[PDB]
Design a protein around this ligand. Structure first.
Ligand code: HEM
Ligand code: HEM
Ligand code: HEM
Ligand code: HEM
Ligand SMILES: [Zn+2]
Ligand SMILES: [Zn+2]
Ligand SMILES: [Zn+2]
Ligand SMILES: [Zn+2]
Lengths: 106, 106, 106, 106
């Protein structure tokens, strides 16, 4: 799917996690984010259209996705332990990742 | 793309790393292994076509990829450092993960 | 060393990284932080001196370190690859982890 | 403690996880392995006693613990979710890391 469509999915489900009542909303949303993150790996963003697939920017770009996927991984385990509040705090920190890539390649 | 196709991309690049001689060979193979692993994230194995996307059977199926992806990510950093023996050793330990999933959902 | 000292090491070397000019400096700081983080593991924060060592608070407190240590590990790889700015970007993110713990336990 | 002792603790609890009946044991066991690995961090093993704490051999030696610690981290989450058998799978899984370091530096 479109990088944009994958971003929108990340964004929708993120908010869903921040306004979640139960651990199940958090689990469902996180699983969805991990899929989006995954399908977004192979994508090349506008600001790097001219760049080489092997350039540092592109390698750094995809690296942000590995970091994200990793932080969603952890988030899920917490939500799985029923520790909702912290699962939400963990989602907040991966936001530190959303911003970073954005400020650099969006 | 397809699961087999991705598993083949996966299976073929593991042997290339095995027969690896230098760092460029290891990187490019791992770089390709990561795209495949990432692309086979949403696939539904055969032995679970009946289970819900949100069922606990899928979560655990998908968990294995998080693991493989994390291991390939780090292995790449090693190959990026010119640490061929190290990188190859890391790859070897991916099997510890490949086999785990296989002896369960293959 | 005690918590305070391992913490001053974390802080000082974090600052070194933010003001670094080359990969050499960052690698050196990250290495010291890896040690300080590893050494701080088993300490009991004062605001938890009354809690049992296996209480949820202490398990959560240690979880903060797993994350921290993991981020210092990845940050270093980036420094070892001569990616100074990316490392500094990773240093900044592991900062979300210093603050997270502190808001909750200091 | 010294390396020997940290290693017994790691060995004693690994087995405890292997023959565990309930999850409580596993959690408790992993937690102790976690502390033993962190403590082993600043250790200089016999075979590398002629190398400095800034050498490639020592960084490779230590990276071995970053790997072990991350695998205990995931093992403990699974044990926290009640997933006991998977926890043992993951535990038997990190043994891959135990050997790999012994085969090279023991
Ligand atoms: C959980 C984290 C993230 C969230 C919630 C998120 C959300 C968004 C949103 C709302 C947009 C605006 C465009 C749209 O979707 O309509 C966007 C765009 C974008 N994101 Fe993210 N994003 C995230 C992570 C990332 C990461 C980690 C990277 C890179 C490593 C990244 C790279 C981009 C790029 C380059 C665009 C622009 C795409 C275009 O203009 O076609 N994003 N994201
Ligand atoms: C890098 C390690 C891995 C390698 C080298 C690998 C390799 C392969 C190969 C060559 C096959 C044989 C059948 C075929 O190719 O058509 C296969 C099948 C399969 N692998 Fe893996 N695999 C790995 C990791 C994993 C992981 C992590 C999972 C689980 C999360 C997994 C799930 C599967 C499944 C479900 C099949 C059967 C596909 C089907 O029947 O359509 N594999 N793998
Ligand atoms: C790179 C990240 C970190 C930095 C830069 C940092 C820095 C500091 C500094 C400068 C202090 C004050 C030292 C003092 O007590 O005199 C401190 C205190 C403390 N930090 Fe951190 N810290 C970090 C991560 C952590 C983490 C992740 C945890 C918990 C998991 C933690 C827990 C604490 C606690 C509880 C104190 C109080 C120490 C005491 O009362 O003796 N720190 N930290
Ligand atoms: C679950 C993981 C591990 C287990 C069960 C384990 C177990 C052991 C045991 C039983 C010994 C026997 C010698 C003695 O106790 O005096 C030992 C020694 C040792 N281990 Fe491990 N170990 C583990 C992981 C590691 C890792 C990850 C490294 C390196 C990164 C490592 C490095 C060593 C070294 C260097 C020795 C030799 C110490 C000496 O000769 O004084 N081990 N370990
Ligand atoms: Zn965790
Ligand atoms: Zn590594
Ligand atoms: Zn990385
Ligand atoms: Zn996990």
């Amino acid at each position: 799917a479109d990088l944009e469509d994958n971003m929108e999915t990340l964004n929708d489900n993120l908010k869903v996690i921040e306004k979640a009542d139960n651990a199940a909303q958090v689990k469902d949303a996180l699983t969805k984010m991990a899929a989006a993150a995954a399908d977004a790996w192979s994508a090349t963003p506008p600001k790097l259209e001219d760049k080489s697939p092997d350039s540092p920017e592109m390698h750094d770009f995809r690296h942000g996705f590995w970091i994200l996927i990793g932080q969603i991984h952890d988030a899920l385990h917490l939500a799985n332990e029923g520790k909702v509040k912290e699962a939400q705090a963990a989602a907040e920190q991966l936001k530190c990742t959303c911003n970073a890539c954005h400020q650099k390649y969006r």
